[PDB]
Amino acid sequence: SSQIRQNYSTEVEAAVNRLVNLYLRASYTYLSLGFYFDRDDVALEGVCHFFRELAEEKREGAERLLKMQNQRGGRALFQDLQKPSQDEWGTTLDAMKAAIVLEKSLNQALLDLHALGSAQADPHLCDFLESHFLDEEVKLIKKMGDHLTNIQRLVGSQAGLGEYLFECCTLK
Amino acid sequence: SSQIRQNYSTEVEAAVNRLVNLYLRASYTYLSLGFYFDRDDVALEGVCHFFRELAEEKREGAERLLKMQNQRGGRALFQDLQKPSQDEWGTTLDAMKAAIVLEKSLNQALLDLHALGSAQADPHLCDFLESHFLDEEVKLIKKMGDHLTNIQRLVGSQAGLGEYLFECCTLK
Amino acid sequence: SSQIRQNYSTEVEAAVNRLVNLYLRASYTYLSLGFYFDRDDVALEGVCHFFRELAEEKREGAERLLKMQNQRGGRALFQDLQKPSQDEWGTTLDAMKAAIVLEKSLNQALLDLHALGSAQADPHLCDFLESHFLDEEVKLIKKMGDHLTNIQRLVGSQAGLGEYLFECCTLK
Amino acid sequence: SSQIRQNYSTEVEAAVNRLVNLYLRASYTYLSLGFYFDRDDVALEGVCHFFRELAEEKREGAERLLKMQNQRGGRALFQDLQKPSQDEWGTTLDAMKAAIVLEKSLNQALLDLHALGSAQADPHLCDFLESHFLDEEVKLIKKMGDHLTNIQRLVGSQAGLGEYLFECCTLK
Ligand SMILES: [Au+]
Ligand SMILES: [Au+]
Ligand SMILES: [Au+]
Ligand SMILES: [Au+]
Ligand SMILES: [Au+]
Ligand SMILES: [Au+]
Ligand SMILES: [Au+]
Ligand SMILES: [Au+]
Ligand SMILES: [Au+]
Ligand SMILES: [Au+]
Ligand SMILES: [Au+]
Ligand SMILES: [Au+]
Ligand SMILES: [Au+]
Ligand SMILES: [Au+]
Ligand SMILES: [Au+]
Ligand SMILES: [Au+]
Ligand SMILES: [Au+]
Ligand SMILES: [Au+]
Ligand SMILES: [Au+]
Ligand SMILES: [Au+]
Ligand SMILES: [Au+]
Ligand SMILES: [Au+]
Ligand SMILES: [Au+]
Ligand SMILES: [Au+]
Ligand SMILES: [Au+]
Ligand SMILES: [Au+]
Ligand SMILES: [Au+]
Ligand SMILES: [Au+]
Ligand SMILES: [Cl-]
Ligand SMILES: [Cl-]
Ligand SMILES: [Cl-]
Ligand SMILES: [Cl-]
Ligand SMILES: [Cl-]
Ligand SMILES: [Cl-]
Ligand SMILES: [Cl-]
Ligand SMILES: [Cl-]
Ligand SMILES: [Cl-]
Ligand SMILES: [Cl-]
Ligand SMILES: [Cl-]
Ligand SMILES: [Cl-]
């Protein structure tokens, strides 16, 4: 019943709905990661807050995709949201590894949707991914890689803790 | 691995996890209702915004339950989130009916959790439901009932539209 | 006599001049639509103002294309501007239909210019259309589709008028 | 000589006086814990300040119970206050363990007073415990559990210190 649809393939429409699922699944993973770190026997509030903010960001990405689906005259379709892959998330290092794997999977999904958009000659879709997704994901993955290295440094050794503290207490 | 748990039954712990599922399912229903009203062939932005706000409120209720689960030393466990019951939501009247049915089901779930809390002599749980849930649900259901009556009045007849307009344009 | 031209095909240069014509023709259509709604026997000032603003937006798009033509070292060439397709525009519904047809034709022209830019390996042109045209057109076409649905709802029936008024007077 | 007493059992009146004793005993324990940490050979001022604030909070709880005793027309009766269980409090971990044991004992006393209030059909008493005691105790016990885990993490190992520092210096 759309009167607006133009140059918007059914292939991209379906891929957008799948990507909304993937972003909401990611948001739900981050909600689980955050509340795990809020447990009294884990009790790292900053890590809870880090993942709570990422749950928000992933929800917001899904909402942006849904708004765009309607802007193009496609039909938002929702599927079941699978529960996160784990119920307990181990150490901060374990959790940050799981997060980077998750973000890499979203980034690959964005790249696959660009490939589809390019094959379907859909420049509005490409511009949309560029405006709101591709560089956001690269920045977040770089931050997570930085965090993995610093966690690895801090937990690994005296030299590494000392080097971290110098950066923080003398330079910053 | 909790060192804090006191007077918190495994029955309530499990019921709280189920209620988190129900609230997140409700939030996901409201996300679908809102984006339906944002379709170009439906195009009632105020109804989209009404349900978008309720998606937020239901998410927030789930997050409050999860925070409380950790405060009591229970273990948050997440399950799959089923997709909403419909993909298209009909008219504003259809949608507001579906919303009141949904809110009634959450209210009954809250009342069942009070019954369990009372049976388990858990006054902190009871106080928690009173502080953040029971009156919030009654207020929202009353608002929805008011909206059902006004939608029914507006769509039904000339007399009803005229009466609505008098309230709005002469009295308010 | 340009000393700046680089990677700018004669094909794109010509297509840009044609697109300036199409945008100025659109602006002139909107000027006619707006003054039609200002007639004393039509007298819908809000519809006049809506189309007056679109006349401005289409002029501004043409001016942006002309600035870009000079930035690239092409030569702006102007042709005659044909008068709008009608002298009287019927009802608000008739007019909004004509507007969406017009905007669709501009959007297809933008997509055709992207195809040409891609074939000519001209990424500055592609970036220019993305920055200032493609999403602007999709947003405007979605707004127009929303308006068509609401006009259709309002003129069509009691149920539809009532539903519109609920959104506006109770929710907004 | 009360002219106001209504629905206030002698059982609850006595239990309230006992609970005032328990809260003042707790306040006195916290005063001893705080000044222990202020010793020059212990010298952890933040731990002194943490327990000094809890001494204040426990005094304030006792004063609230006494105000309520008079509001209901019962008679405040004071007994001797026993000295705290230890004269020296060991390490921060030892002290935080002793504190959580203390708070658990107050929480159980509050739950026992709810049981008595419910048996005596005294809803004002129940509302009073809900308003000012039950959730305050759960929040404080959760904070103490968080602190036990972080102390245990910090004192236990290199990995644990590193993880703590990451939360604090990189995330917070
Ligand atoms: Au969290
Ligand atoms: Au947090
Ligand atoms: Au692309
Ligand atoms: Au593309
Ligand atoms: Au630092
Ligand atoms: Au530092
Ligand atoms: Au520092
Ligand atoms: Au919405
Ligand atoms: Au909305
Ligand atoms: Au209850
Ligand atoms: Au209860
Ligand atoms: Au009104
Ligand atoms: Au009104
Ligand atoms: Au009015
Ligand atoms: Au006008
Ligand atoms: Au006007
Ligand atoms: Au292009
Ligand atoms: Au290009
Ligand atoms: Au309105
Ligand atoms: Au209105
Ligand atoms: Au109104
Ligand atoms: Au002190
Ligand atoms: Au102190
Ligand atoms: Au009670
Ligand atoms: Au009671
Ligand atoms: Au810190
Ligand atoms: Au720190
Ligand atoms: Au720091
Ligand atoms: Cl969280
Ligand atoms: Cl299903
Ligand atoms: Cl493309
Ligand atoms: Cl929404
Ligand atoms: Cl499963
Ligand atoms: Cl109870
Ligand atoms: Cl005009
Ligand atoms: Cl000529
Ligand atoms: Cl290109
Ligand atoms: Cl002190
Ligand atoms: Cl004595
Ligand atoms: Cl009672």
Residue numbers in the entry:
A (entry chain A), B (entry chain A), C (entry chain A), D (entry chain A): 1 to 172
Paper text:
Our preliminary experiments with gold ions using Cys mutants (161 C/165 C and 168 C/169 C) demonstrate the potential of the 4-fold channel of apo-ferritin as a site for constructing Au clustering. Another important insight is that the side chain of cysteine is relatively short, making the interaction between Au atoms bound on different monomers rather difficult. In addition, the binding mode presents less diversity with a common pattern of one cysteine binding to two Au atoms acting as a bridge. Therefore, to create an Au clustering site at the 4-fold channel, coordination residues with longer side chain and larger rotamer space are needed to build the interaction between Au atoms from different monomers.
Ferritin is a self-assembly protein cage consisting of 24 subunits with an 8 nm interior cavity. The 4-fold channel is composed of four E-helices forming a parallel four-helix bundle with C4 symmetry. Herein, we have engineered and constructed a gold clustering site at the 4-fold symmetric axis channel of the apo-ferritin cage. Using a series of X-ray crystal structures, we evaluated the stepwise accumulation process of Au ions into the cage and the formation of a multinuclear Au cluster in our designed cavity.
